[PDB]
Amino acid sequence: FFHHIFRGIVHVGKTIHRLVTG
Numbered sequence: 001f002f003h004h005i006f007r008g009i010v011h012v013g014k015t016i017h018r019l020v021t022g
Helices: 002-020
Strands: none
Touching: none
């Protein structure tokens, strides 16, 4: 549960960082 919740946070931030970074 905790590992899954933390993993989703990393992907969410990673997605935003990728979109912002050209």
